[model samples]
Target: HWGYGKHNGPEHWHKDFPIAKGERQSPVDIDTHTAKYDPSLKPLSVSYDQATSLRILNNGHAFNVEFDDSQDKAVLKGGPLDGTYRLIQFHFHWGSLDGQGSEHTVDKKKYAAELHLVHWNTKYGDFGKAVQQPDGLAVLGIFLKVGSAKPGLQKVVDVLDSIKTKGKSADFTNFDPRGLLPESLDYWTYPGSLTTPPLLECVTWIVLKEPISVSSEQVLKFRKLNFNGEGEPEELMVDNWRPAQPLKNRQIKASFK
Candidate 1:
């Protein structure tokens, strides 16, 4: 199993998942000055049904909010996507401190955290198969800056106590993911991969330019989550982000001028 500890961290992941060094690996450092202004990109359309929300689970990696993606009721479209993409789940990546945590950076600057709302392209059938195909997954990345409290996010934080240990889950229903969006949808789009293990190069990353605010106290609660199971030695679930990868020949496009 991989983790953020010194032995099994990002540096060692390439040994198990060779694709970690692949050309299109994710969480790249976004140099805003170099991002090309592509007026062709459409405004992102994300319609999420609160009813589609299922449960929240501490998967030992990060706590994920799973959704019922059997249909397109809660889906993402437009904005670089060729077809409809079903919302599968959303998760977060953060650090022990308030200064750094986000996987992708802006001019080498890190944020307090990052939220990824993962969707699978309908053209590729299911998430299992879609994750292996290029253009098969679209992940919306929103950076979190430490500031004021976000009531929408607080709902998620309140449940962390119930699932303090790894492999624990609780009913998380009627939650609207749209409430988590920042004021502006302007984003940087590029070809990338999952920040975590397997590190598949199948994601179409749309990282928001404007970051949402999160209070310092709220983030401290997230650090309380343990990576270990109930009976195992406890390990705080912090610094769950991968370092920025090389840009290579990839062209990053900006939705705004």
Candidate 2:
């Protein structure tokens, strides 16, 4: 199985999925000086119904917080999207310890971790049908820091004790994802991929410039998660992030100067 290990790491991925070497690969270094100031970018619109939060799953990769996107209950309309994008699932990537493991680095520095809220373009169809095209996915990437304990986040970490292994998911309802983000909506935009297996180059990255704080104890809770199934030999889930890929010639746009 291709995973974040020495034997089956990102360096060896292109052997199986040729697209791993694709032009728009994700987890790139976000050089703040290089990003263009685009005043034309619209303020991002995020309208999510708290009731739409359905469950949280440990997919062996990350803890996926899914939503009932069957309708337009939660969607992204402006920013870089042409039409509406429905929220499918949101997940996190972190180190076994604090102070590292985020995918995209700003000014070539890694933070505590990262958060990805994946959405699919409703203009094409459902997320399944849309995953195949270039304009299909739009992911909002947020950085996580080890600082204050977010009572809001404690609700999520509290559930980890039950789903300590992969393939386990539990009910997670009425949680407003907006509350998890930083106060500033300022972000950087670029075209990128899924950052995992298959590495589909469909996502239009909307990365927030400001990072939200999660207490040190919170980061400790995140590290307790295992990458293996329940009965499997224990393997801590950390360094799950793919190292940065070459940017080639892609232009990153910033919503603010």
Candidate 3:
């Protein structure tokens, strides 16, 4: 029975959940002038079963995809990319309108929203243990825009009708995330933290520059998810996105030519 109230939102998570106050936090603004550019990052193809093993948990506040390396082959090891990493959880951050929703800002520009794909290093055991290590996590950020219809995300959108109510999430089995990734693997990488609770500062962020377009109608549908308990039939669950944060003294890097 998880729910996200104004008082219990991410800003106040540390109070109730002590673990939420980790040093590292995510949804930091991405400024290209301060980011280091490299052009050699690629995501390995993960098997269907491995990708399906991911658990999609709707914690009221946001939707999180728990990672299970034990059941996947998509692991990263060594380099600036050193460490045995595995997909852990993934979620999204959006705005009230289709105009702005991204958590990370690029050169002061905001996208419709941002999708985060979280991963942990297997060398440190599971995600819980990995969060303690500086090089234990990796997050992929994708920007969303409103324009031409996107077929890649249709699968995820289709499930919305089933979980339209608050605190509801239907099991999305046999779903492959690979198709959801932008066509280009080229990305910008950096060191950051979790955007939400337990804001651990152990993540290596790889954000894709290419933007994906979602229909304006789709954006409106996302806003309809309830924020309160399922008891209410008309409670709108939109505007769950967080405001952007300052990027302390951290350096951002990219894998590009």
The candidate that wins on TM-score is 1
Q: Give the TM-scores of the predictions, in the order they appear.
A: 0.98, 0.97, 0.82
Return the number of clashes found in candidate 2. Answer: 0
Tens-digit lDDT track of model 1 for 24-113: 999999998999899899888978854378899999999999999998878889999889999999999999998899999999999999
By TM-score, how accurate is candidate 3?
A: 0.82
**Model 3 over residues 1-257: C-alpha lDDT tens digits?**
22345666667766755645444456667777767764455543333235643445445666665545574455544324665567666677777776677878788788887888777777777777888877778777889888877776676776666665545666666666676567776677767776666567788877788888788877776776655556765656655665555566666666664
The residue-level lDDT of candidate 3 at 217 comes to: 78
Give per-residue lDDT, candidate 3, residue 16. 59
Evaluation by TM-score, superior candidate among 2 and 3: 2
Question: Clashes in each model (backbone N, CA, C under 3 Å)?
Answer: 0, 0, 16
CA RMSD for every model? 0.9, 1.1, 3.5
Q: Report the Cα lDDT for residue 174, model 3.
A: 60
Error of 2 at 141 (Å): 0.6
